[PDB]
Amino acid sequence: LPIRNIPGNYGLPIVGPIKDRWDYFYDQGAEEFFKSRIRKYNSTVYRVNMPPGAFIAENPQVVALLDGKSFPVLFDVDKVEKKDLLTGTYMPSTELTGGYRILSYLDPSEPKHEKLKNLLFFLLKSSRNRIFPEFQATYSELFDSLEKELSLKGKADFGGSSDGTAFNFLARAFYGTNPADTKLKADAPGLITKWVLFNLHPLLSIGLPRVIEEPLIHTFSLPPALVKSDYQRLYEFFLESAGEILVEADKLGISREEATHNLLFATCFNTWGGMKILFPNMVKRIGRAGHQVHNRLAEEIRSVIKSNGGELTMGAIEKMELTKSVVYECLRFEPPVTAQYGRAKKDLVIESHDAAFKVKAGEMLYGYQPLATRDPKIFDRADEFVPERFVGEEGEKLLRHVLWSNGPETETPTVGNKQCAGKDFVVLVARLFVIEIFRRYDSFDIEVGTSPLGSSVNFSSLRKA
Numbered sequence: 001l002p003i004r005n006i007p008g009n010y011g012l013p014i015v016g017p018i019k020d021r022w023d024y025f026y027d028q029g030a031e032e033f034f035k036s037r038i039r040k041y042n043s044t045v046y047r048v049n050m051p052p053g054a055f056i057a058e059n060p061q062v063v064a065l066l067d068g069k070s071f072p073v074l075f076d077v078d079k080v081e082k083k084d085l086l087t088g089t090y091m092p093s094t095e096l097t098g099g100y101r102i103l104s105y106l107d108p109s110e111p112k113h114e115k116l117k118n119l120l121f122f123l124l125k126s127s128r129n130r131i132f133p134e135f136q137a138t139y140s141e142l143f144d145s146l147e148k149e150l151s152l153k154g155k156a157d158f159g160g161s162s163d164g165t166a167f168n169f170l171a172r173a174f175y176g177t178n179p180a181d182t183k184l185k186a187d188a189p190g191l192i193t194k195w196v197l198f199n200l201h202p203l204l205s206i207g208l209p210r211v212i213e214e215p216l217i218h219t220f221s222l223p224p225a226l227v228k229s230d231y232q233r234l235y236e237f238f239l240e241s242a243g244e245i246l247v248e249a250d251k252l253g254i255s256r257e258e259a260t261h262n263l264l265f266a267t268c269f270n271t272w273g274g275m276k277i278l279f280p281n282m283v284k285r286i287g288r289a290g291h292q293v294h295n296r297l298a299e300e301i302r303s304v305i306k307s308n309g310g311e312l313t314m315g316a317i318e319k320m321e322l323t324k325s326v327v328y329e330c331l332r333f334e335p336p337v338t339a340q341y342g343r344a345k346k347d348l349v350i351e352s353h354d355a356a357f358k359v360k361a362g363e364m365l366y367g368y369q370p371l372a373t374r375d376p377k378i379f380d381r382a383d384e385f386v387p388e389r390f391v392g393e394e395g396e397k398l399l400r401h402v403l404w405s406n407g408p409e410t411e412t413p414t415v416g417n418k419q420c421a422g423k424d425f426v427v428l429v430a431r432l433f434v435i436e437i438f439r440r441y442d443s444f445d446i447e448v449g450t451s452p453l454g455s456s457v458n459f460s461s462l463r464k465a
């Protein structure tokens with residue numbers, strides 16, 4: 001491949017980044033922000049300013065990787081450093097996380113990365129016999145409530161009940177604890193939402209006019225002091241509920257305090273937060289796929305469970321080919337977290353489809369994942385949601401290009417890499433979610449709107465089996 005100069009520029013100090021931030025949030029939106037510049041520069045690799053800049057991030061300058069050939073450099077821990085860049089070119093105050101740099105911010109070169117990731121692997125393994133029954137019980141209650149709401153209002157808001165369901169499910173599955181039996185009662189979603197806002201506001205729009213939003217959430221950090229008492233309520237819940245997991249933390253040589261803040265983060269930010277994005281997005285894409293797809297899913301799911309004596313098991317799920325494929329297609333089409341960063345550790349040569357680009361040690365690399373996973377030089381019908389895309393031997397090969405977990409779907413998270421520690425769990429619960437929908441319903445209709453995280457979704461019909 002020819003070596004090309006990396007196109008793009010950062011504009012003037014102060015005003016360049018501000019204009020780019022306006023495009024990103026208001027005048028273009030993320031997808032068109034990136035696509036318009038791919039067109040202008042005739043390149044899927046280019047220099048661009050990323051939010052937040054202002055007084056939140058020291059340096060907004062990145063090299064963007066916007067195709068599925070260049071993007072995977074972001075996974076290579078021998079090429080990129082992954083320290084303090086979970087959220088990009090700024091890091092939320094450690095005052096938001098008990099004074100600790102939490103696992104997700106740690107480079108694999110840091111010894112506590114191995115210890116803490118092992119702790120989460122244990123959490124997940126130890127929960128294995130609780131996941132199915134607790135998912136089925138909590139999500140059954142959710143669909144009961146949605147049917148109730150639909151009967152009253154003619155529509156049922158998914159997100160504002162499903163957030164409670166997700167936390168209750170996680171508390172019961174991971175910790176054998178029903179939040180209703182604790183001081184948290186039903187408050188957890190509100191507490192976590194506020195705390196997440198204090199962490200991620202520089203990256204989000206909350207729908208307000210830019211004249212309000214820009215000074216309020218895009219210029220300076222919200223003060224961590226204002227969420228400390230809410231966080232303490234969460235901390236005490238984890239400290240008191242996570243006894244069994246804290247025993248393993250002790251054996252791994254992690255302090256009780258550090259383990260607790262890490263369990264809180266993994267459960268509330270990584271898991272509950274990721275589910276908050278993923279589940280409504282899944283309802284949106286599956287809804288749009290139409291009733292014929294719904295009927296095919298219902299037929300497969302119900303037939304398979306019947307073949308399994310009515311027992312839903314991991315092996316039964318492996319028979320649900322369309323279901324597995326639909327879940328992967330949600331993850332490919334609409335990666336729940338679009339932004340992955342990595343700082344070049346050394347000088348690199350980054351290959352794209354038609355050229356290679358040289359980057360210097362210290363440059364911040366950034367990838368907008370949807371452009372890698374909807375790359376038409378990798379996927380046919382790239383901008384179409386194709387339920388059956390991953391069905392069969394040939395379809396399954398394409399899983400190497402599904403990147404939602406910050407690594408190929410064909411690869412395994414390890415203590416040596418920065419791939420999502422919960423990769424198998426996410427894919428499992430996403431499958432269980434589809435299964436619970438279509439064991440109950442033949443088909444459904446939805447109404448859709450915007451949300452600061454993910455999508456706002458109402459059900460307008462739920463056709464019972």
Ligand code: HEM
Nearest residue numbers: 103104120270271274275278336337406417418420421422
């Ligand atoms: C739908 C839910 C989830 C989504 C969308 C998601 C997504 C991601 C992504 C994109 C990353 C890469 C972050 C980066 O460096 O840029 C990540 C990392 C991580 N996730 Fe997940 N995740 C989810 C659930 C979970 C669960 C269930 C766990 C429980 C262990 C978890 C724990 C972690 C941890 C600890 C990291 C950092 C890994 C490391 O430091 O090596 N996440 N996740």
Ligand SMILES: CCCCC[C@H](O)/C=C/C=C\CCCCCCCC(=O)O
Nearest residue numbers: 086087196269270273274336337338339
């Ligand atoms: C509340 C955060 C939910 C996602 C948790 C998941 O485990 C990984 C997070 C990774 C990076 C932190 C920034 C998350 C920003 C998500 C919304 C904007 C986007 O998609 O880039």
Ligand SMILES: CCCCCCCC
Nearest residue numbers: 193196197206452453
């Ligand atoms: C009015 C509150 C806005 C909701 C913020 C949610 C961000 C996680």
Ligand SMILES: CCCCCCCC
Nearest residue numbers: 206216217222226227
């Ligand atoms: C949009 C940010 C509002 C800040 C909330 C502070 C109230 C404790």
